[PDB]
Design a protein around this ligand. Sequence first.
Ligand SMILES: O=c1cc(Br)ccn1CCO
Ligand SMILES: O=c1cc(Br)ccn1CCO
Lengths: 298, 262
Amino acid sequence: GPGSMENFQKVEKIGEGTYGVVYKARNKLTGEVVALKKIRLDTETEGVPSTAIREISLLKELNHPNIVKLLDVIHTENKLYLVFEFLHQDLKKFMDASALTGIPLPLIKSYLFQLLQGLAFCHSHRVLHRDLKPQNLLINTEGAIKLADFGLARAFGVPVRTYTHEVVTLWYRAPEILLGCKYYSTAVDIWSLGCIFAEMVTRRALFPGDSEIDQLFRIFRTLGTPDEVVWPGVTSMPDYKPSFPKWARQDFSKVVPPLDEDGRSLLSQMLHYDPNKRISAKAALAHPFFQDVTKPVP
Amino acid sequence: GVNEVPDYHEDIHTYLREMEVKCKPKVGYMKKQPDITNSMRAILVDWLVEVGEEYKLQNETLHLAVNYIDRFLSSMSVLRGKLQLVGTAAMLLASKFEEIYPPEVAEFVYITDDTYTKKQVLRMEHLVLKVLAFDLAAPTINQFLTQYFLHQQPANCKVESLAMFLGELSLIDADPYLKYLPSVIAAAAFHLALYTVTGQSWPESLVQKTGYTLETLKPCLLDLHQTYLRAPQHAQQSIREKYKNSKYHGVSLLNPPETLNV
Ligand SMILES: O=c1cc(Br)ccn1CCO
Ligand SMILES: O=c1cc(Br)ccn1CCO
């Protein structure tokens, strides 16, 4: 497009997906620091990967301050270069390295508020993210946080069709996926954000299971085992089994003790079993938890 | 419920309306093509219909591919010997975009009866990506149809299938469907389907949603009604064969209405 490799100076390697490496680079003409994702095609026998086709096509359309920006695509015969806006850190590294005694409540609130804006924008543009987790949320020095990594994302129709199953890194995966439901929707992204919300408060994953069935059990032990009353249809779902242990719902103030009443409310509405009752990003932006939201920097 | 995305359906409809305009092919491009014709295009699309059913691809994939092809042929002049190569790469790209399990490149080579090599298919893949500038999330007839369907009271699967069928028939014939947006052909197709099966007409709720009336749909509707009447005679028959299937409620066997009464 409007760019060539000649104008970038590589600085260091910042990352590596299953597609290849990411480097921090600098535009020698403008000064701009960028992230270069290299996708190698020469090595590809199946042409341009679908993951990349989705990432590029979907990201081209998503201009929003809380969505990482695809600046350019450099398209050689052997290689594909995605040029991205550069951000210094992800939320996972931030929680591990600097949030040793906690993320302050103002910053949690600011981050969650920005993530909801970003996600709301995705849903409004018929895009499911399908891999929201702390590793895929990028923070800058200005206090912004941005949805990143749209390699697992998907353009949806209304109503949704059956899409790929076992999507979403396991710890962040919604019950409706774990129970093998024919259809899933925007609610799967909210679940992930719910898990992340909790994770920002405690600095530890809310449901760190080691298999599909263990993930379900840890969720059920925290939120109670769902039945027809809380979630109509649950007991009909393909991978629902009647033999499931029936755990009691624990009071929500025990799930995330440091959290205030508004927090708890918002969290409960993000982690509702029934995807139909689960709160939307758009509605969540109005929740009282955000009444005093600011944008503090890390 | 959430499967119909209550909180986003309007935003999405509005967005699709703006995008269908951006993704629109050039209405007059076939006259500007020295070596290919509407007739050759119809042959290609009919073939892609057969490819979709042999590999049990989504209908959405079929629609995306036709969008890619028409946009490509809007700026790139193609010899008749290469038309199929464009179509094949289009179908591959559309498959990678929309399918859970796309056919492998080699299968795409296979269906071309070794007219082309895997290298030619992959290089064309790259060319199409360049020409479209990766702009692949195109609104289709289907994307509008599925939304319009939410306005049936109650849902009628014969209506739904017949609307899909009519919409697919429109892909075959650049003249005259290149001149109508997906949203408008979808509307025409929904009303015709609804009228054919139940006698009912384009609902007021869809007038509210879309701003379209039978007034504004009338041109397209007249064309679609003709296409439906002469479908048993069309040279291209693969869509009619596919809609005889039970998956689609055998709606191709339904009889077209002889008149629309406005
Ligand atoms: O991997 C990175 C790192 C940065 Br910093 C920006 C973008 N990407 C690609 C995924 O968004
Ligand atoms: O040769 C082919 C093959 C297909 Br499939 C479509 C169009 N043409 C052009 C001449 O009919």
